[PDB]
């Protein structure tokens, strides 16, 4: 049983759930792809921001859609407006701000989707579609919670602010300058900030730490034109041969990173820290099963979680400029770019990591005595983020979770990076409430959010409004 007429709010959410799921279906069908520099998609992104601005206004919010200007690509594209919305300015009330994004990662059905990525399809309680979990589901769950108090003419316990952007999947272009401009304007008197764009691991969760990241591009160039692999086979220093040797020099079969210096500054594992991991709830057979992975690099819960949260990791993403379509093309690529990144943990320095990776790659390349040119560039470099657990925002969330799910949340870290979390910490001086399941498949084929997570998460947000008012 819930408290109060949270009972009535909860009743409302259960009765309007099919409507909440149809709104999500409608938002998902707007192909708000920010990553493709294609006018068709950027227009759909602007329409998305407009649909959201209208939704917030209809709820009762003062809404501003802030003109963001051009995105320099030697061409350019307009950036989608940022919604800056306020619902209530009651001086007898605290104020909570919610950040979300309504742009999505590209989705091509040919990538391996069993459904049309932009048609929300429910299969065994799972709602499949691009943006279902990342991030239209949790934005709507928050909005739908507010709309329950509004429909019932129930006083919202806190004032609510919304900051919603349309460029998160493309580096939040122009957000930081707007935030900076607004630090003592829109953010003046905002008590706590909420982000809901992350997943559980098993038991619901609250997330209080994230990894950093460093994204590397390694270009090996002969000439711009490719070669016929037979007509010119046998006589070139082939860009692909150099790149494959460069990429193959980075990590070993155990996951151990081979760049010298990389472990120098990782904080030492302590007894205390080990204990924190032992207290997390994770069935390793369950985790193997939802991931459909035969075996992981490690055998125990503690090793698995630590390698995700507090050890660095290296992933090779792909190669650009070579033969990557289906079939059997006989080509020596003239210019290729390897892509890989290293997730960063305390106490690693971004600038040192950049130096170390570069030096390593130069040393490998020079030993090849190749005629090719190599350019390493670190295109992205972010430090890790940690919240203070048992902050007032963090306690409200714990209580809200207990109310809705009837159990204590585990305090978890995250292997991914939430750059926005760091940005609000640096400029405005954040609580992460995950709604997604571990197997939601964000940034992949067959992304979903579970109906239960989406609907029960709406209730979580409702309870949370009330908890924030209570300190």
Least gap, CB of 354 to Zn ion (angstroms): 24
Query: Whole-number minimum distance, CB 103 to Zn ion, in Å?
Result: 8
Give me the least distance between CB of 414 and Zn ion, in Å please. 12
- By beta-carbon proximity to Zn ion, the closer residue of 197 and 219 is 197
Helices vs strands, H then E, count in the chain: 13, 20
**C-alpha pair distances (Å), 347 with each of 60, 313, 419:** 45, 14, 17
Q: Is 45 left (phi over 0), alpha (psi -120 to 50) or beta?
A: alpha
Regarding 134 and contact with Zn ion (CB under 5 A), the answer is yes
414 binds Zn ion (CB under 5 A): no
Smallest distance from the beta carbon of 239 to Zn ion, in angstroms? 31
CA–CA gap between residue 117 and residue 32 (Å, rounded)? 12
Of 197 and 410, the one with the shorter C-beta distance to Zn ion is: 197
For Zn ion, give the closer residue by CB, 134 or 226: 134
CB of 105 to Zn ion, least distance (A): 6
103 lies in the binding site for Zn ion (CB under 5 A): no
Long-range Cβ pairs for the range 230-239 (8 Å, 24+): 230/330, 232/332, 233/332, 236/332, 237/368, 237/370, 237/371, 237/372, 238/332, 238/333, 239/321, 239/332, 239/333, 239/334, 239/335, 239/336, 239/372
Q: Give whichever of 204 and 434 is closer to Zn ion, judged by the CB atom.
A: 434
Q: At what angle do helices 137-151 and 39-59 cross, to 10 degrees?
A: 20
Q: How many residues bind Zn ion (CB under 5 A)?
A: 3
Question: In the chain, after which residues is the C-to-N distance over 2.5 Å, breaking the chain?
Answer: 73, 202, 429
- Site track for Zn ion across 197-226, x = CB under 5 A: x-----------------------------
Q: How far is the CB of 316 from Zn ion (least distance, A)?
A: 20
CA distance 429 to 199: 25
**Of 105, 96, 104, 128, residue with least CA distance to 195:** 96
Is 135 near Zn ion (CB under 5 A)?
A: yes
Is 197 a known ligand-binding residue? yes
168 is a catalytic site residue? yes
Phi–psi pair at 435, nearest 5 degrees: -105, -20
196: contact with Zn ion by CB under 5 A: no
The answer to whether the beta carbons of residues 316 and 190 sit under 8 Å apart is: no
Nearer to Zn ion, 103 or 456 (CB): 103
Part of the chain binding Zn ion (CB under 5 A), chosen from 193-201, 249-257, 375-383, 448-456: 193-201
> Contact region for Zn ion (CB under 5 A) — 127-135, 210-218, 253-261, 463-471?
127-135
Q: How far is the CB of 134 from Zn ion (least distance, A)?
A: 4
The answer on whether 134 is annotated among ligand-binding residues is: yes
Catalytic, out of 33, 44, 168, 226: 168
54 known member of a binding site: no
228 assigned to a ligand binding site: no
Q: State yes or no: 443 annotated in a binding site.
A: yes
- The two tokens of residue 282 are 């994770």
Instruction: Select which of 31, 33, 44, 103 is catalytic.
Output: 103
3-class DSSP state of 246: helix
State how beta strands 385-386 and 82-87 pair. unpaired
3-class SS string, 395-435: HHHHHHHHHHHCCCCEEEEECCCCHHHHHHHHHCCCEECCC
CB of 198 to Zn ion, least distance (A): 8
Sign of the alpha-carbon torsion through 2, 12, 462, 127: positive
The phi and psi torsions of 38 (rounded to 5 degrees) equal: -125, 120
**Contact range with Zn ion by CB under 5 A, out of 89-97, 130-138, 315-323, 382-390:** 130-138
Alpha-carbon span 282 to 154, nearest angstrom: 39
Long-range Cβ contact pairs of 168-172 (< 8 A, separation 24 or more): 168/34, 168/101, 168/103, 168/135, 168/420, 169/34, 169/35, 169/101, 169/103, 169/104, 169/105, 170/34, 170/35, 170/71, 170/103, 171/380, 172/419, 172/420, 172/423
Residues flagged as binding site for Zn(2+): 101, 134, 169, 197, 443
Residues flagged as binding site: 101, 134, 169, 197, 443
Binding-site ranges for Zn ion (CB under 5 A): 134-135, 197
Q: Which residues are catalytic?
A: 103, 168
């Amino acid at each position: 049983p819930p408290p109060a007429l949270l009972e009535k709010v909860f009743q409302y959410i259960d009765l309007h759930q099919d409507e909440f799921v149809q709104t999500l279906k409608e938002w998902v069908a707007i192909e708000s792809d920010s990553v493709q520099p294609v006018p068709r998609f950027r227009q759909e992104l602007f329409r998305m921001m407009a649909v959201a601005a209208d939704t917030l206004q209809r709820l009762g919010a003062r809404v501003a859609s802030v003109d963001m200007g051009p995105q320099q690509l030697g061409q350019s594209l307009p950036i989608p407006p940022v919604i800056l919305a306020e619902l209530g300015s009651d001086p007898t009330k605290g104020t909570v701000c919610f950040y979300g994004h309504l742009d999505v990662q590209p989705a091509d059905r040919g990538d391996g989707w069993l459904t049309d990525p932009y048609v929300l399809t429910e299969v065994d309680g799972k709602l499949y579609g691009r943006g279902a979990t990342d991030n239209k589901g949790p934005v709507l769950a928050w909005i739908n919670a507010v709309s329950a108090f509004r429909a019932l003419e129930q006083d919202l316990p806190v004032n609510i602010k919304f900051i919603i952007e349309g460029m998160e999947e493309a580096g939040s272009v122009a957000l930081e300058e707007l935030v900076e401009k607004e630090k003592d304007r829109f953010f003046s008197g905002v008590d706590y900030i909420v982000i809901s764009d992350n997943l559980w691991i098993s038991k619901p969760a609250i997330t209080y730490g994230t990894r950093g990241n460093s994204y590397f591009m390694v270009e090996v160039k002969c000439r711009d034109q490719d070669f016929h692999s037979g007509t010119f086979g046998g006589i070139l220093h082939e860009p692909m041969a150099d790149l494959v040797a460069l990429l193959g020099s980075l990590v070993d079969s155990s996951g151990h990173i081979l760049v010298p210096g990389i472990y120098d500054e990782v904080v030492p594992l302590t007894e205390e820290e080990i204990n924190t991991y032992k207290a997390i709830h994770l069935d390793l057979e369950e985790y193997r099963n939802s991931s459909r992975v035969e075996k992981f690099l490690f055998d125990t819960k503690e090793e698995i979680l630590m390698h995700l949260w507090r050890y660095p990791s290296l992933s090779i993403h792909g190669i650009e400029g070579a033969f990557d379509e289906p079939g059997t093309k006989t080509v020596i690529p003239g210019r290729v770019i390897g892509k890989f990144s290293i997730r960063l943990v305390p106490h690693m320095n971004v600038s040192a990591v950049e130096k170390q990776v570069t030096r390593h790659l130069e040393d490998v390349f020079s030993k090849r005595n190749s005629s090719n040119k190599m350019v390493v560039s670190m295109t992205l470099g972010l430090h890790p983020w940690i919240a203070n657990i048992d902050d007032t925002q963090y306690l409200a969330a714990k209580r809200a979770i207990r109310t809705v799910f009837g159990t204590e949340p585990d305090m978890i870290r995250d292997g991914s990076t939430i750059p926005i979390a760091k940005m609000f910490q640096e400029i405005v001086h954040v609580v992460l409430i995950p709604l997604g399941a571990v197997d939601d498949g964000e940034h992949s084929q067959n992304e979903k959010i579970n109906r239960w997570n989406y609907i029960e998460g709406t209730k979580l947000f409702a309870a949370f409004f009330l908890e924030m008012a209570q300190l």
